[PDB]
Symmetry: C4
Subunit: 223 residues, 4 copies
């Protein structure tokens, strides 16, 4: 029904393995069409090497019901859905277990801004969520994963339009952007700064976060 | 005699270098046919770039005798054989010296479950065996390697159907699955969580294992 | 106007992703034509996969004005320009956020010469600049970035003709050479010794810099 | 004059970049023909992408004089020559600055045998030479590099036929084998165990070397 959108999502999903952000069939990308009140996401149970635009599922932003698609949508759909409702300014969402961002997630630590690379895409510390409670995990898990992300941002007063990424404790990174592609680009940068953050800490364990002035210069410049 | 099986094993063996789990000619994959009472394994002394389905050797589960094949079977055949007898629920076995899982093996340490990535494929700590005794090593080595793996699981009360992987002290990883391919996939995940485990420990040296509830959620969900 | 130069710069810019020194559209290479009093640099807002020789911008060494080009020049142009004026003996300049050199930059640490690999291309410690002041950052930023590099070399008495590289605190590496290509080669070596420096320090935290005699032997030999 | 030999050396040299053991034009492989009293080595000043069998230089084992070749031989030729004279049982020599083996070399540390991977190709600790003296470095450098390697083996009573590799302090690895190809394979394994050695030490800083029985089992088995 939104072929050009299914195209953008399809291509973004195929970009995941190309940029070495995923292995096997992990990861998923989706894009939203606000006026349509629906979002398109990667299908569940489909290899990237077989995946076609027609496999992309159409889901209702409001009810989470599949508006079009023969395939089952990604099991992470509720999280995507929740985030679209919570963050009005986002147009695309990426979820992967990219190695280095996931290392930070598993460590339960937030990625501090120590470089201009990071400053160009994330306005400050990339937050790692608190652990989910036993209740949240055994309840509507994916949806709750979304709630934990949103709570993290509200409690810490972080603007989602200025921080297109987050780490889910013991799980992995979630990133987003203006559209499917933009979302994928933010995901690849999140992985890059995660990688560099590990080793810059090793070289300088008592390294202070970058100068606020430098952070501002680079983030405010773009956007 | 089981061309379709020799095909599955051949392709799984060719997948090893493609997924960067092996170098030169290290590694080997095999698949079993219970009703036939035989398993098919990679040949010894054959480059992956030359390897053909006909090179796959057929071996007796009960006697370890080669039922069909011009080439000599992998020197690890006894280990595979032992594991098939010991673990009834397995249909394929992978052995490699994939770098990161091997780093843990050489360190003689078990890979703790610190993420959902790990939880999705291994139900808990991926065990590293104790060192083999001088007698075991100088006896029927490969077979003894199998016995050490099995003892590890029995002593620690770990169900092989829920933990498709193990690290052999000072040696390397062994993984298995429902079939040759499934076995290969578990092998690649074992390498991924081994990689991430190294660095998540570095970021958080006193990091506790993941929440049991989270572990259960992810493992019990699949399967 | 200098097609053969735009060719050299174009090809050098396309070499950046090929040598895994860049991601997305980061990085930029330029080459100068002293007699012409102009330098050619990568355009801003152009994917490497689309980039053509015609996209290369021509800029005035003296005024920084674009002498020819439909596209906007890289935002790092002022830095390049400043460096050409400051260092007469350089013919090409490379700027990237290559992961490992950037890790050192973010750590705010200089890369010590601990090997012959390093000695072959950099005559001594590869310097990391001091942090830029709030004023410098909020002023003519790129130009000031150049001034900080130059001050680093003058204060520390380092000859730019013998040290074709520098790390900008919290930012990334800048490298240069006799021409666009030579500049790119120095950039790739800077990344290699940055990578090895991290881990050689890990293996030997109290490792002294390499023998001066060895350093001299290798650097003075070439050149 | 020995086209089939120039072929083996050519192909081995082209294998260096393919196995990611080299960058730019670093590294060199050579093979010897004892009965002929000559060895063939990679030429100096030739990109791997242009390199042809005819570019391979023929050198006298006894005098180090070029018996055939339009191109200048690798600057490491004296080292190769010395090693051929010193170690009668070797038929090929590889020299690279492969990242991880070089990290150990720069750290001035020997790679301890902590795994079967290592045991399969190197019978024990892979030695790192002592630092060269100012005199050795400023004398016939490459030849002296060879003498330091040989002294290392004699002083420590290590059989070159059982240890096809060595690390030259602050420099890089040298490996050898029965022929050009065998030499290249040993070089790639040296890099693999160097990589794993770094991180296995990190996981277990007080890790003892592998069981002698295990070391013997694996090395004595092959060969
Ligand atoms: Zn996930
Ligand atoms: Zn093995
Ligand atoms: Zn930059
Ligand atoms: Zn060298």
């Amino acid at each position: 029904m939104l072929e050009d959108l299914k195209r953008q999502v399809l291509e973004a999903n195929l970009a995941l393995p190309k940029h070495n952000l995923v292995t096997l069939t992990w990861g998923n990308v989706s894009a939203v069409d606000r006026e349509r009140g629906v979002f398109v996401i990667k299908p569940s149970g489909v290899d990237y090497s077989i995946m076609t635009a027609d496999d992309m599922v159409v889901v209702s932003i409001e009810t989470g019901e599949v508006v079009e698609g023969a395939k089952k949508p990604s099991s992470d759909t509720p999280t995507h859905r929740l985030l679209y409702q919570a963050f009005p300014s986002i147009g695309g969402i990426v979820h992967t277990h990219s190695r280095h961002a996931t290392i930070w997630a598993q460590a339960g630590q937030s990625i501090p801004a120590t470089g201009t690379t990071h400053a160009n895409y994330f306005y400050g510390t990339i937050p790692c969520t608190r652990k989910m409670t036993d209740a949240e995990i055994n309840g509507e898990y994916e949806w709750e994963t979304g709630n934990v992300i949103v709570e993290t941002f509200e409690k810490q007063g972080i603007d989602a339009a200025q921080m297109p990424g987050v780490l889910v404790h013991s799980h992995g990174p979630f990133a987003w952007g203006k559209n499917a592609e933009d979302a994928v680009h933010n995901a690849i940068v999140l992985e890059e700064v995660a990688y560099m953050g590990i080793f810059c800490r090793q070289l300088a364990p008592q390294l202070p976060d970058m100068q606020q002035t430098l952070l501002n210069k680079h983030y405010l410049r773009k956007h």
